[PDB]
Structure formats: C-alpha cells, structure tokens
Amino acid sequence: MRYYESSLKSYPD
Amino acid sequence: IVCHTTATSPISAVTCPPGENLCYRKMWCDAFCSSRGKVVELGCAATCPSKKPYEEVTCCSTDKCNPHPKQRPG
C-alpha cells in the first residue's frame, strides 16, 4: 500500500 | 511542467503552476522504516523546501518529471 522506492501496486507485505 | 502526488491518496501528475513553480520529490520513512527503504512522496512546490533534519526533499520542473521507481519495468 505505498508508492515506495521499489513498487507501485499498493503491496501490503 | 506537471508534478505527481504520492502524498495525496493515489498518484497523478497535475499542473501546479499557481504558486509552485515546479515539482518536488520527497522521501523519508513510513509507519516503520521497512528494509525496502523510505517511500516516494513527490508533488508540487515553490522551491525545494525542508532541508535541516533528515527530510530528503527534491525538485523537478518538466513534463511530469516526478517519476520514482514505481512500476519496475524489465
């Protein structure tokens, strides 16, 4: 659930 | 030039000419600094603000120049 510095699909884990 | 907003709710590049002369990429840490690093909360701004403690704010003035490592292509 974040547009972190390595993912853009709201990943929970 | 337009900027994306990861700190609003979803993420989208909206023109921010009224006030913010450009965009800004921020980073820090969420509820718990995971091993994945911080987050990527860019947006619009008048000038790269915040720069005293550990806030790594950034800037970008170009056709949506706030693309972070989101959809890792390849």
mmCIF file of N, CA and C in Angstrom:
data_model
loop_
_atom_site.group_PDB
_atom_site.id
_atom_site.type_symbol
_atom_site.label_atom_id
_atom_site.label_comp_id
_atom_site.label_asym_id
_atom_site.label_seq_id
_atom_site.Cartn_x
_atom_site.Cartn_y
_atom_site.Cartn_z
ATOM 1 N N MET A 1 0.853 -1.223 0.000
ATOM 2 C CA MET A 1 0.000 0.000 0.000
ATOM 3 C C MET A 1 0.875 1.255 0.000
ATOM 4 N N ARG A 2 1.873 1.303 -0.843
ATOM 5 C CA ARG A 2 2.755 2.506 -0.872
ATOM 6 C C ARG A 2 3.397 2.692 -2.241
ATOM 7 N N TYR A 3 3.692 3.909 -2.582
ATOM 8 C CA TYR A 3 4.418 4.166 -3.851
ATOM 9 C C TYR A 3 5.853 4.300 -3.405
ATOM 10 N N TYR A 4 6.333 3.267 -2.784
ATOM 11 C CA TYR A 4 7.692 3.300 -2.217
ATOM 12 C C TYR A 4 8.739 3.413 -3.298
ATOM 13 N N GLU A 5 9.946 3.312 -2.880
ATOM 14 C CA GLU A 5 11.092 3.413 -3.827
ATOM 15 C C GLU A 5 11.381 2.055 -4.475
ATOM 16 N N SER A 6 10.364 1.288 -4.766
ATOM 17 C CA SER A 6 10.598 -0.042 -5.403
ATOM 18 C C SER A 6 9.278 -0.800 -5.581
ATOM 19 N N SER A 7 8.211 -0.110 -5.878
ATOM 20 C CA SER A 7 6.906 -0.812 -6.063
ATOM 21 C C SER A 7 5.770 0.197 -6.252
ATOM 22 N N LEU A 8 4.800 -0.132 -7.064
ATOM 23 C CA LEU A 8 3.662 0.805 -7.289
ATOM 24 C C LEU A 8 2.343 0.033 -7.370
ATOM 25 N N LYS A 9 2.185 -0.986 -6.572
ATOM 26 C CA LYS A 9 0.916 -1.765 -6.608
ATOM 27 C C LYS A 9 0.366 -1.935 -5.196
ATOM 28 N N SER A 10 0.388 -0.883 -4.425
ATOM 29 C CA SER A 10 -0.133 -0.953 -3.027
ATOM 30 C C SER A 10 0.185 -2.313 -2.397
ATOM 31 N N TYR A 11 1.418 -2.741 -2.460
ATOM 32 C CA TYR A 11 1.778 -4.062 -1.866
ATOM 33 C C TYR A 11 1.709 -3.992 -0.337
ATOM 34 N N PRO A 12 0.960 -4.901 0.232
ATOM 35 C CA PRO A 12 0.808 -4.944 1.706
ATOM 36 C C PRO A 12 2.090 -5.464 2.361
ATOM 37 N N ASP A 13 2.512 -6.646 2.005
ATOM 38 C CA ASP A 13 3.755 -7.208 2.606
ATOM 39 C C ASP A 13 4.987 -6.637 1.898
ATOM 40 N N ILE B 1 5.013 22.237 -17.169
ATOM 41 C CA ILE B 1 5.561 21.134 -16.326
ATOM 42 C C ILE B 1 4.515 20.680 -15.303
ATOM 43 N N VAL B 2 4.399 19.397 -15.090
ATOM 44 C CA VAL B 2 3.399 18.891 -14.104
ATOM 45 C C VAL B 2 4.092 18.028 -13.050
ATOM 46 N N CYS B 3 3.472 17.846 -11.920
ATOM 47 C CA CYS B 3 4.104 17.024 -10.851
ATOM 48 C C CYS B 3 3.141 15.942 -10.372
ATOM 49 N N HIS B 4 3.659 14.843 -9.892
ATOM 50 C CA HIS B 4 2.769 13.748 -9.396
ATOM 51 C C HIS B 4 2.606 13.846 -7.891
ATOM 52 N N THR B 5 1.530 13.343 -7.352
ATOM 53 C CA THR B 5 1.382 13.417 -5.889
ATOM 54 C C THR B 5 1.186 12.034 -5.306
ATOM 55 N N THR B 6 2.169 11.594 -4.626
ATOM 56 C CA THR B 6 2.091 10.280 -3.951
ATOM 57 C C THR B 6 1.591 10.516 -2.529
ATOM 58 N N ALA B 7 1.679 11.741 -2.078
ATOM 59 C CA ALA B 7 1.257 12.063 -0.693
ATOM 60 C C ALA B 7 -0.204 12.529 -0.606
ATOM 61 N N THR B 8 -0.978 12.384 -1.645
ATOM 62 C CA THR B 8 -2.405 12.816 -1.549
ATOM 63 C C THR B 8 -3.286 11.593 -1.289
ATOM 64 N N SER B 9 -3.236 10.630 -2.160
ATOM 65 C CA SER B 9 -4.038 9.393 -1.961
ATOM 66 C C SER B 9 -3.633 8.343 -3.002
ATOM 67 N N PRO B 10 -3.784 8.671 -4.265
ATOM 68 C CA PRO B 10 -3.410 7.741 -5.339
ATOM 69 C C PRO B 10 -2.031 8.125 -5.915
ATOM 70 N N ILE B 11 -2.024 8.870 -6.998
ATOM 71 C CA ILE B 11 -0.778 9.309 -7.661
ATOM 72 C C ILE B 11 -1.161 9.840 -9.040
ATOM 73 N N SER B 12 -0.857 11.061 -9.315
ATOM 74 C CA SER B 12 -1.229 11.624 -10.637
ATOM 75 C C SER B 12 -0.475 12.920 -10.873
ATOM 76 N N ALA B 13 -0.134 13.198 -12.098
ATOM 77 C CA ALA B 13 0.612 14.446 -12.383
ATOM 78 C C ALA B 13 -0.338 15.595 -12.681
ATOM 79 N N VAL B 14 -0.519 16.486 -11.757
ATOM 80 C CA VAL B 14 -1.408 17.635 -12.039
ATOM 81 C C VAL B 14 -0.567 18.896 -12.157
ATOM 82 N N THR B 15 -0.947 19.748 -13.036
ATOM 83 C CA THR B 15 -0.199 21.016 -13.219
ATOM 84 C C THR B 15 -0.222 21.824 -11.918
ATOM 85 N N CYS B 16 0.905 22.321 -11.488
ATOM 86 C CA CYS B 16 0.932 23.101 -10.225
ATOM 87 C C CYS B 16 1.600 24.463 -10.443
ATOM 88 N N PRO B 17 1.140 25.161 -11.447
ATOM 89 C CA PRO B 17 1.701 26.495 -11.765
ATOM 90 C C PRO B 17 1.255 27.596 -10.774
ATOM 91 N N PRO B 18 0.089 27.461 -10.169
ATOM 92 C CA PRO B 18 -0.376 28.511 -9.224
ATOM 93 C C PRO B 18 0.389 28.442 -7.896
ATOM 94 N N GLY B 19 1.542 29.051 -7.831
ATOM 95 C CA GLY B 19 2.329 29.031 -6.564
ATOM 96 C C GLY B 19 3.578 28.181 -6.751
ATOM 97 N N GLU B 20 3.419 26.892 -6.818
ATOM 98 C CA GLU B 20 4.592 26.010 -7.002
ATOM 99 C C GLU B 20 5.166 26.209 -8.400
ATOM 100 N N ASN B 21 6.365 26.704 -8.484
ATOM 101 C CA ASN B 21 6.977 26.939 -9.815
ATOM 102 C C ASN B 21 7.493 25.622 -10.390
ATOM 103 N N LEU B 22 7.432 24.564 -9.627
ATOM 104 C CA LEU B 22 7.917 23.258 -10.147
ATOM 105 C C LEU B 22 7.376 22.098 -9.310
ATOM 106 N N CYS B 23 8.077 21.001 -9.306
ATOM 107 C CA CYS B 23 7.624 19.812 -8.542
ATOM 108 C C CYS B 23 8.611 19.491 -7.429
ATOM 109 N N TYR B 24 8.385 18.430 -6.718
ATOM 110 C CA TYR B 24 9.328 18.074 -5.638
ATOM 111 C C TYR B 24 9.218 16.604 -5.287
ATOM 112 N N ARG B 25 10.320 15.951 -5.146
ATOM 113 C CA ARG B 25 10.269 14.514 -4.772
ATOM 114 C C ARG B 25 10.717 14.373 -3.314
ATOM 115 N N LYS B 26 9.874 13.884 -2.444
ATOM 116 C CA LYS B 26 10.299 13.749 -1.027
ATOM 117 C C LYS B 26 10.458 12.287 -0.666
ATOM 118 N N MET B 27 11.176 12.035 0.374
ATOM 119 C CA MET B 27 11.373 10.641 0.821
ATOM 120 C C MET B 27 11.687 10.650 2.298
ATOM 121 N N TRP B 28 11.375 9.596 2.973
ATOM 122 C CA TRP B 28 11.623 9.592 4.426
ATOM 123 C C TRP B 28 11.453 8.183 5.005
ATOM 124 N N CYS B 29 10.308 7.894 5.529
ATOM 125 C CA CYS B 29 10.048 6.546 6.094
ATOM 126 C C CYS B 29 8.569 6.453 6.473
ATOM 127 N N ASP B 30 7.962 5.316 6.300
ATOM 128 C CA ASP B 30 6.517 5.200 6.645
ATOM 129 C C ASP B 30 6.349 4.751 8.101
ATOM 130 N N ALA B 31 5.214 4.195 8.436
ATOM 131 C CA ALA B 31 4.985 3.742 9.841
ATOM 132 C C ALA B 31 6.256 3.108 10.412
ATOM 133 N N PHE B 32 6.859 2.216 9.681
ATOM 134 C CA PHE B 32 8.104 1.564 10.172
ATOM 135 C C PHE B 32 9.118 1.463 9.031
ATOM 136 N N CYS B 33 10.182 2.217 9.096
ATOM 137 C CA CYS B 33 11.199 2.159 8.005
ATOM 138 C C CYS B 33 11.450 0.704 7.605
ATOM 139 N N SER B 34 10.772 0.234 6.594
ATOM 140 C CA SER B 34 10.964 -1.180 6.160
ATOM 141 C C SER B 34 12.323 -1.347 5.474
ATOM 142 N N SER B 35 12.730 -2.563 5.235
ATOM 143 C CA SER B 35 14.042 -2.791 4.565
ATOM 144 C C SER B 35 13.963 -2.342 3.104
ATOM 145 N N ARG B 36 12.791 -1.988 2.650
ATOM 146 C CA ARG B 36 12.642 -1.538 1.238
ATOM 147 C C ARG B 36 13.103 -0.084 1.099
ATOM 148 N N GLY B 37 13.407 0.557 2.194
ATOM 149 C CA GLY B 37 13.861 1.975 2.127
ATOM 150 C C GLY B 37 12.735 2.891 2.611
ATOM 151 N N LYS B 38 12.699 4.106 2.135
ATOM 152 C CA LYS B 38 11.623 5.037 2.551
ATOM 153 C C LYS B 38 10.468 4.917 1.573
ATOM 154 N N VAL B 39 9.788 5.993 1.341
ATOM 155 C CA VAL B 39 8.680 5.970 0.360
ATOM 156 C C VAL B 39 9.079 6.865 -0.807
ATOM 157 N N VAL B 40 8.131 7.471 -1.440
ATOM 158 C CA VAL B 40 8.443 8.392 -2.557
ATOM 159 C C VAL B 40 7.272 9.333 -2.687
ATOM 160 N N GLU B 41 7.296 10.354 -1.904
ATOM 161 C CA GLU B 41 6.167 11.301 -1.894
ATOM 162 C C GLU B 41 6.537 12.619 -2.569
ATOM 163 N N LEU B 42 6.468 12.669 -3.868
ATOM 164 C CA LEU B 42 6.804 13.935 -4.577
ATOM 165 C C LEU B 42 5.557 14.817 -4.653
ATOM 166 N N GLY B 43 5.564 15.813 -5.495
ATOM 167 C CA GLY B 43 4.359 16.691 -5.608
ATOM 168 C C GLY B 43 4.740 18.038 -6.224
ATOM 169 N N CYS B 44 4.098 19.094 -5.806
ATOM 170 C CA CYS B 44 4.416 20.432 -6.369
ATOM 171 C C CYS B 44 4.968 21.337 -5.270
ATOM 172 N N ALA B 45 5.663 22.381 -5.627
ATOM 173 C CA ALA B 45 6.205 23.284 -4.583
ATOM 174 C C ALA B 45 6.789 24.553 -5.200
ATOM 175 N N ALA B 46 7.000 25.557 -4.392
ATOM 176 C CA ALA B 46 7.588 26.819 -4.913
ATOM 177 C C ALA B 46 9.111 26.678 -4.967
ATOM 178 N N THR B 47 9.656 25.881 -4.088
ATOM 179 C CA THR B 47 11.132 25.669 -4.065
ATOM 180 C C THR B 47 11.465 24.519 -3.110
ATOM 181 N N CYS B 48 12.383 23.664 -3.481
ATOM 182 C CA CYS B 48 12.747 22.518 -2.592
ATOM 183 C C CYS B 48 12.777 22.975 -1.129
ATOM 184 N N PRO B 49 11.687 22.731 -0.450
ATOM 185 C CA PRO B 49 11.556 23.133 0.966
ATOM 186 C C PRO B 49 12.088 22.047 1.909
ATOM 187 N N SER B 50 12.138 22.347 3.180
ATOM 188 C CA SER B 50 12.629 21.359 4.186
ATOM 189 C C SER B 50 14.012 20.822 3.823
ATOM 190 N N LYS B 51 14.962 21.043 4.681
ATOM 191 C CA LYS B 51 16.345 20.545 4.428
ATOM 192 C C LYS B 51 17.215 20.770 5.666
ATOM 193 N N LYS B 52 16.728 20.401 6.817
ATOM 194 C CA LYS B 52 17.529 20.623 8.062
ATOM 195 C C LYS B 52 17.756 19.323 8.859
ATOM 196 N N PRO B 53 16.711 18.563 9.100
ATOM 197 C CA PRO B 53 16.863 17.322 9.886
ATOM 198 C C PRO B 53 17.263 16.143 8.992
ATOM 199 N N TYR B 54 16.305 15.422 8.480
ATOM 200 C CA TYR B 54 16.632 14.246 7.617
ATOM 201 C C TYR B 54 15.658 14.158 6.440
ATOM 202 N N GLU B 55 14.830 15.149 6.260
ATOM 203 C CA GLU B 55 13.864 15.109 5.126
ATOM 204 C C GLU B 55 14.618 15.260 3.800
ATOM 205 N N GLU B 56 14.578 14.258 2.967
ATOM 206 C CA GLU B 56 15.301 14.343 1.665
ATOM 207 C C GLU B 56 14.362 14.854 0.571
ATOM 208 N N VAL B 57 13.938 16.082 0.666
ATOM 209 C CA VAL B 57 13.027 16.635 -0.374
ATOM 210 C C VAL B 57 13.798 16.857 -1.677
ATOM 211 N N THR B 58 13.116 16.889 -2.789
ATOM 212 C CA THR B 58 13.820 17.106 -4.084
ATOM 213 C C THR B 58 12.980 18.007 -4.987
ATOM 214 N N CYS B 59 13.424 18.241 -6.190
ATOM 215 C CA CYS B 59 12.631 19.104 -7.108
ATOM 216 C C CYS B 59 12.622 18.541 -8.510
ATOM 217 N N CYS B 60 11.769 19.077 -9.316
ATOM 218 C CA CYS B 60 11.718 18.646 -10.729
ATOM 219 C C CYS B 60 10.765 19.550 -11.525
ATOM 220 N N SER B 61 11.265 20.217 -12.530
ATOM 221 C CA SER B 61 10.385 21.108 -13.341
ATOM 222 C C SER B 61 10.360 20.657 -14.810
ATOM 223 N N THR B 62 9.533 19.700 -15.148
ATOM 224 C CA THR B 62 9.471 19.229 -16.561
ATOM 225 C C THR B 62 8.219 18.367 -16.763
ATOM 226 N N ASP B 63 7.890 18.055 -17.986
ATOM 227 C CA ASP B 63 6.682 17.219 -18.241
ATOM 228 C C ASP B 63 6.642 16.032 -17.273
ATOM 229 N N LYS B 64 5.939 16.164 -16.183
ATOM 230 C CA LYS B 64 5.861 15.042 -15.203
ATOM 231 C C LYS B 64 7.262 14.502 -14.904
ATOM 232 N N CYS B 65 8.118 15.307 -14.335
ATOM 233 C CA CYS B 65 9.490 14.810 -14.025
ATOM 234 C C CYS B 65 9.553 14.238 -12.607
ATOM 235 N N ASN B 66 8.449 13.770 -12.088
ATOM 236 C CA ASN B 66 8.457 13.198 -10.708
ATOM 237 C C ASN B 66 8.249 11.668 -10.719
ATOM 238 N N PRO B 67 8.739 10.992 -11.741
ATOM 239 C CA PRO B 67 8.577 9.520 -11.802
ATOM 240 C C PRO B 67 9.591 8.835 -10.883
ATOM 241 N N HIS B 68 9.130 8.125 -9.895
ATOM 242 C CA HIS B 68 10.073 7.422 -8.982
ATOM 243 C C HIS B 68 10.171 5.959 -9.429
ATOM 244 N N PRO B 69 10.828 5.126 -8.660
ATOM 245 C CA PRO B 69 10.918 3.707 -9.043
ATOM 246 C C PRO B 69 9.592 3.053 -8.669
ATOM 247 N N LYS B 70 8.609 3.222 -9.507
ATOM 248 C CA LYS B 70 7.260 2.669 -9.206
ATOM 249 C C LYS B 70 7.027 1.354 -9.940
ATOM 250 N N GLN B 71 6.652 1.415 -11.184
ATOM 251 C CA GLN B 71 6.386 0.159 -11.927
ATOM 252 C C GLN B 71 7.696 -0.429 -12.461
ATOM 253 N N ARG B 72 8.520 -0.958 -11.595
ATOM 254 C CA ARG B 72 9.814 -1.542 -12.052
ATOM 255 C C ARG B 72 9.615 -2.332 -13.350
ATOM 256 N N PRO B 73 9.979 -1.711 -14.440
ATOM 257 C CA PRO B 73 9.840 -2.356 -15.768
ATOM 258 C C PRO B 73 10.902 -3.445 -15.949
ATOM 259 N N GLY B 74 11.026 -3.973 -17.136
ATOM 260 C CA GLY B 74 12.043 -5.036 -17.377
ATOM 261 C C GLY B 74 11.338 -6.372 -17.615
#
